[PDB]
C-alpha cells in the first residue's frame, strides 16, 4: 500500500495501529521544481516503538488466552505516523481501502482485509485528522494518548474513544497548584496545535477565575523559525514572572528549551503538562540548569505482567511480522543491517534508550487497555445471548461477519474490569477518568540524569477544592533549592499601607501607598 | 455549503449507519456554485485564456459538515489514490484543483487530505489563522 | 450609525464611571483594573485630571 514500512500480521480480525516511531520528518522545503517525493522521518522514537510492542503484546496475549476470545485470532496492521498528519492520513487511507472502495465502487484486489478497529494516534492534531476520516465509516478509534478537549465532541468525532483523560482536569490541577503555592504572576506557553491551545485556554479561564494574572501568552511550534523563537525568548526574558505554564509536547518544545539553555536563562519554574513532563527530549541532564525543579503531571502507572520479557525478546531476524525491528536494531546499536555491521546477536540490555529503562508504564498501559477494550467488545459480541443483546429485538452480531459499527456500538456500552481490578467504562463523551501523579524534575546523585519523583497526586474523584494534594517536603525547587520561590507581581503591602493602581498593568500588580493621617489599616 | 447542516441521528441500535440527510437550504451557497460555473464557462468561451482547451468541473455539497466534505474529497482524489496507493474502473477523472470549502474546520479537514497529493485548494470563505501554517497545509491557498 | 438601530449616542460600556477630579481610583478586591472606586483625595492633596 502507501507506506512501504509497516508491522503487520494476518488474522481473523485486523486491528489498525498508529504509533510515532519518529519525532518528525526531514525539514525539506520543496520548491516543486520536480515531482514531489515522499519525505523521510529523522529522529527515532523508542517510546513509540515500546508502545507498538505494547499493542503487539496485548494482541498476542489475547490470542493465546482461550478465556477471552476462544476460536478467534486477532491480527494487526500497525503503521508509522512520525508525528505528522500526512503520514497518518496515508496510513488511514490504507486502513479504509475496503470500505471506501465499497462506497465508491471503482470496480481491485477484492481480498484486502477490513480494519475492525484502530488504536488512535498520539498527538491531538493527528488524532483529529485521523478521526475525521475514520468516523466516516464508523470504524472505532481508541486513542491512548490524545487528550485534547476538542475530541470529546461526539457530534464531529462519532467513533472516537480514548483511554486517557482530557486536559480539563489537567488545567484545573495546574490552576490548583498555582493557587496552592500562593502565586499570581505567571506565564503561559502553548504548542501551536490542537493539544496546547485548548488546554492553555482552559487554564487561562480557570486562572482568571482564581484571580491569577498571566503576564504573557505565547505559542510555539516544532517548525518555528529563528525570528519567532527569538521573540518568544525575549518576552520570557523581559517578564518578571518566575513560574511559567507550558502546554506542549516534547518535539514542539525542544527548540525553545534549546534557545533558553543557550541563553542560560535561569530562575524560572516550569509547570509541565503531562505530554512533556516525562519527555526524554527535554529531560536531559545538560538542560538541568534550566529545566531543573520542573513540576509536571503523569498518569497512573499500570501493571502489565510479562511485558518486560516481551520487550527484551525483540530480535530483527526472529520478528517476521514486525518490520520496524530492523531500524530499531540499527538505531540502538549504531550499526547497519545488510557505520559498522550488525552481528545479529547483540544484547539489547546493554544500551540505554527509552525502550527498556522505564520506571512506570503510563501510555503503554493506555495502549494495553485500548487493545483489551476492543477485544472485550469483540468478546461481548461473541458471548451475546440472542433475545437480550444490545441490538434490535435482542439480536446479536454475527461473529463471522462482524462490522466496525457493531464494535463501536458495543464499545459505547462497555463495562469491564482490567487486570489491576479497576472498572473500565467510556462515558457518553467517549473518554475515561483517571488520577494524576505530580512529579518534580530532580538530578540523580549516582547517575547525574533527570529523575522524576512523585511529590503528590491529584484525585479527580474528590470534591472541588480538595482534589490537589502536594507533599512539599519532597520538592526541590529549581532542582536544588528548598524555599518556595516568590512569584507575586509586586510585594505585599504591610499594615498602615494601601494598594495603589498602576495604569495599564493587571490588578495583581500595585504600588504600596501609606494611609493618610486620619486613617489606619490593620491587616 | 448548499445546506446549512444535517439532520439528527445517533445511537445505532443495530441499524447499519446510513447517509444523514441535510436539512436546511442556503441560497448563498448555490450562488457561489453558480459563480464558479459562470467563471468556468466564460473561461471556456474566451479564446484568449487557455486556447484550445475546455475547463471541466466536478462540484459537491459540504452541508457545512466534515463528513460530507470528506466523502466529496475522497471522490476527488480517487485517481491520485489509485496512482499512489496502487489499489479498477480505469476511467477516473483527474481532478487537478479544488476550490476550497467554506468552513474553517471543513477546509482544514479537506486540506489535511488534499495535501497528500499536493492538489491546490483555493478557498474563498475560510479565513482562520490556523490555515496559514504551510508546514501542515502544503497545498492550501486562500 | 444608528447605535441600537434607532439611537444616535455611543453607549456607555465601562465597568465603573469615570472618577471626578477631586477623587482617585480605588481597587476592588477580586475585580479587574477596569473596575475601581472613587475614593476622595485626602486633605492637602489634589488631582486635576
Ligand atoms: C502572592 O499573591 C497572593 C495573592 O494573589 C498572596 O496570597 C494571599 O495570601 C494571604 C496570606 O498568605 C491570604 O490572606 C490571601 O487571601 C491570599 N490572596 C488571595 C487572593 O487569596 C500570596 O501571599 C503572595 N505571595 C507572597 C510571597 O507574597
Ligand atoms: N499531543 C499529544 C502530546 C504527546 C506526545 N507524546 C505524548 C506522550 C504521552 C502523552 C502525551 C503526548 C497528546 O496530547 O497526547
Ligand atoms: N457564513 C459565512 C461563512 C464563513 C466566512 N468566513 C469563514 C471563516 C471560517 C468559517 C466559516 C466562514 C460566509 O458566508 O461567508
Ligand atoms: C524586551 O526587552 C528588550 C531589551 O530591553 C527590548 O529591546 C524589547 O523591545 C522588549 N520587548 C520585546 C517584546 O522583546
Ligand atoms: C549558566 O549559568 C549558571 C548559573 O549559576 C552557571 O553556573 C553556569 O556555569 C552557566 N553556564 C554557561 C555555559 O554559561
Ligand atoms: C459495571 O459493572 C460493575 C459490576 O458489578 C457494576 O458494579 C458497575 O455499576 C457497572 N457500571 C456501569 C456504569 O454500569
Ligand atoms: C485516586 O486517588 C484517590 C485518593 O488518593 C484514591 O482513593 C483512588 O483510589 C484513586 N483512584 C484509583 C483508580 O486508584
Ligand atoms: Ca479466548
Ligand atoms: Ca497594558
Ligand atoms: Ca479558447
Ligand atoms: Ca474575580
Spell out which chain A residues touch chain C, with contact meaning CB-CB distance below 8 angstroms: 211, 499, 501, 505-507, 510, 516-519
* Residues paired with A143 in a beta bridge: A162
For A13-43, give the secondary structure using H, E and C: EEEEEEECCECCECCCCCCCCCCCCCCCECC
Mutant choice from B5, B7, B11, B14 vs A, greatest count of A C-beta within 10 A: B14
Q: Rounded to 5 degrees, what are φ and ψ at A345? A: -135, 20
SS3 A373: helix
What is the rounded distance in angstroms from the CA atom of residue C1 to the CA atom of residue A511? 42
Ligand 6 atom nearest residue A423's Cα = 1
Contact A56, A76 (CB under 8 A): yes
**Helix H segments across A399-510?**
404-412
From the list A55, A234, A49, the residue with the least C-alpha distance to A144 is: A55
Atom 11 of ligand 3, nearest CA residue: B103
Q: At A165, which helix (H) or strand (E)?
A: none
Which structural technique was applied? cryo-EM
Spell out which chain A residues touch chain B, with contact meaning CB-CB distance below 8 angstroms: 1-2, 32, 36, 85-86, 89-90, 93-94, 97, 100-101, 103-104, 106-109, 112, 125, 129, 132-133, 135-136, 138, 154, 156, 158, 192, 221, 223, 390-392, 395, 403, 405, 408-409
For A187-204, give the secondary structure using H, E and C: EEEEECCCCHHHHHHHHH
State how far residue A203 is from chain C, nearest Cα, in angstroms: 18
What is the rounded distance in angstroms from the CA atom of residue A58 to the CA atom of residue C8? 71
For A334-357, give the secondary structure using H, E and C: CCECCCCECCCCCCHHHCCCCCCC
Is the distance from the beta carbon of residue A423 to the nearest atom of ligand 6 less than 6 Å?
A: yes
For residue A311, count other CB atoms closer than 10 A to its CB. Answer: 19
Is the distance from the beta carbon of residue A488 to the nearest atom of ligand 1 less than 6 Å?
A: yes
Spell out which chain B residues touch chain A, with contact meaning CB-CB distance below 8 angstroms: 10, 12-17, 66-67, 70-71, 74-75, 78, 81-82, 84-89, 92, 105, 109, 112-113, 115-116, 118, 133, 135-136, 138
| b/e per residue A111-123 (b: at least 16 CB within 10 A) | eebbbbbbbbbbb
Contact A123, A249 (CB under 8 A): yes
How far away, in angstroms, is A409 Cα from ligand 6 center?
18
C-alpha cell at A67: 478465556
Give the contacts of A197 (CB within 8 A, at least 6 positions apart): A190, A191, A219, A247
Name the pairing type of β-strands A269-272 and A243-247.
parallel
* Alpha carbon A426 to chain centroid, angstroms: 18
Give, in degrees to the nearest 5, the angle at Cα B20 between B16 and B23. 155
Contact A240, A185 (CB under 8 A): yes
Name the pairing type of β-strands A7-9 and A74-80.
antiparallel
**Residues in chain A after which the chain is broken, C→N over 2.5 Å:** 107, 338
For residue A245, count other CB atoms closer than 10 A to its CB. Answer: 28
From the list A237, A304, A399, A375, the residue with the least C-alpha distance to A50 is: A304
Q: Rounded to 5 degrees, what are φ and ψ at A46? A: -75, -25
SS3 A218: strand
Q: Rounded to 5 degrees, what are φ and ψ at B78? A: -60, -40
What is the rounded distance in angstroms from the CA atom of residue A197 to the CA atom of residue A468? 23
Q: Which ligand is nearest to the CA of A182?
A: 1
Q: At B69, which helix (H) or strand (E)?
A: helix B66-76
From the list A167, A134, A129, the residue with the least C-alpha distance to A148 is: A167
For A383-430, give the secondary structure using H, E and C: CCCCCCCCCHHHCCCCHHHCCHHHHHHHHHCCEEECCCCCEEECCCCC
Q: At A313, which helix (H) or strand (E)?
A: none
Question: DSSP letters of A267-290?
Answer: S-EEEE-TTTTT-TTT--GGGHHH
Give the contacts of B76 (CB within 8 A, at least 6 positions apart): B58, B95, B98, B114, B119
Name the pairing type of β-strands A160-162 and A213-220.
unpaired
Q: Rounded to 5 degrees, what are φ and ψ at B132? A: -80, -15
**Helix H segments across A97-140?**
97-104, 124-134
| b/e per residue A367-376 (b: at least 16 CB within 10 A) | bbbbbbbbbb
SS3 B109: helix
For residue A367, the number of C-alpha atoms closer than 13 Å in the C-beta half-sphere is 28
Q: What is the resolution of this structure in A?
A: 3.1
All chains having 3 or more CB pairs closer than 8 angstroms to chain A: B, C
Amino acid at each position: 500500500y502507501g507506506p512501504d514500512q509497516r508491522a503487520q500480521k494476518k488474522g481473523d480480525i485486523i486491528l489498525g495501529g498508529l504509533f510515532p516511531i519518529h519525532f518528525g520528518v526531514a525539514a525539506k522545503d520543496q520548491d516543486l521544481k520536480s515531482r514531489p517525493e515522499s519525505v523521510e522521518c529523522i529522529r527515532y522514537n523508542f517510546r513509540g516503538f515500546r508502545w507498538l510492542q505494547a499493542m503487539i503484546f496485548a494482541i498476542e496475549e489475547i490470542n493465546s488466552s482461550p478465556a477471552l476470545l476462544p476460536n478467534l485470532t486477532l491480527g494487526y496492521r500497525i503503521f508509522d505516523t512520525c508525528n505528522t498528519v500526512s503520514k497518518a492520513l496515508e496510513a488511514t487511507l490504507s486502513f479504509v481501502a475496503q470500505n471506501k472502495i465499497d462506497s465508491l465502487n471503482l470496480d481491485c484486489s477484492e481480498h484486502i482485509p477490513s480494519t475492525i478497529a484502530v488504536v488512535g494516534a498520539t498527538g491531538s492534531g493527528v488524532s483529529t485528522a485521523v478521526a475525521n476520516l475514520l468516523g466516516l465509516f464508523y470504524i472505532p478509534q481508541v486513542s491512548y494518548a490524545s487528550s485534547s478537549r476538542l475530541l470529546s465532541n461526539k457530534n464531529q468525532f462519532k467513533s472516537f474513544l480514548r483511554t486517557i483523560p482530557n486536559d480539563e482536569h489537567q488545567a484545573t490541577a495546574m490552576a490548583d497548584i498555582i493557587e496552592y503555592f500562593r502565586w499570581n504572576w505567571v506565564g503561559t506557553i502553548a504548542a501551536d496545535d490542537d493539544y496546547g491551545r485548548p488546554g492553555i485556554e482552559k487554564f487561562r479561564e480557570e486562572a482568571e477565575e482564581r484571580d491569577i494574572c498571566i503576564d504573557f501568552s505565547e505559542l510555539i511550534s516544532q517548525y518555528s523559525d529563528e525570528e519567532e523563537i527569538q521573540h518568544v525568548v525575549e518576552v520570557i526574558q523581559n517578564s518578571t514572572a518566575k513560574v511559567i505554564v507550558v502546554f506542549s509536547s516534547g518535539p514542539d518544545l525542544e527548540p525553545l528549551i534549546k534557545e533558553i539553555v543557550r541563553r542560560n536563562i535561569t530562575g524560572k519554574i516550569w509547570l509541565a503538562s503531562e505530554a512533556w513532563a516525562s519527555s526524554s527530549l527535554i529531560a536531559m541532564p545538560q538542560y538541568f540548569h534550566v529545566v531543573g525543579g520542573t513540576i509536571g503531571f503523569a498518569l497512573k502507572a499500570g501493571q502489565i505482567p510479562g511485558f518486560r520479557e516481551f520487550l527484551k525478546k525483540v530480535h530483527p531476524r526472529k520478528s517476521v511480522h514486525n518490520g520496524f525491528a530492523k531500524e530499531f536494531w540499527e538505531e540502538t546499536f549504531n550499526c547497519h543491517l545488510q557505520r559498522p555491521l550488525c552481528t545479529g546477536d547483540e544484547n539489547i540490555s546493554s544500551v540505554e534508550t527509552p525502550y527498556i529503562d522505564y520506571t512506570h508504564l503510563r501510555i503503554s498501559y493506555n495502549v494495553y487497555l485500548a487493545v483489551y477494550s476492543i477485544a472485550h467488545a469483540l468478546q461481548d459480541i461473541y458471548t451475546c445471548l440472542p433475545g437480550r443483546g444490545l441490538f434490535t429485538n435482542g439480536s446479536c452480531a454475527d461473529i463471522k461477519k462482524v462490522e466496525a459499527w457493531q464494535v463501536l456500538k458495543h464499545l459505547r456500552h462497555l463495562n469491564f474490569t482490567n487486570n489491576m481490578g479497576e472498572q473500565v467504562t467510556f462515558d457518553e463523551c467517549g473518554d475515561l477518568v483517571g488520577n494524576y501523579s505530580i512529579i518534580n524534575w530532580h538530578l540523580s546523585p549516582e547517575d547525574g540524569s533527570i529523575v522524576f519523583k512523585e511529590v503528590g497526586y491529584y484525585n479527580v474523584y474528590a470534591k472541588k477544592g480538595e482534589r490537589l494534594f502536594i507533599n512539599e517536603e519532597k520538592i526541590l525547587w529549581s532542582g536544588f533549592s528548598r524555599e518556595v520561590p516568590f512569584s507575586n507581581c509586586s510585594r505585599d503591602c504591610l499594615a498602615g499601607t494601601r494598594k495603589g493602581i498602576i495604569e495599564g498593568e493587571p490588578t495583581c500588580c500595585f504600588e504600596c501607598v501609606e494611609c493618610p493621617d486620619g486613617e489606619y489599616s490593620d491587616e
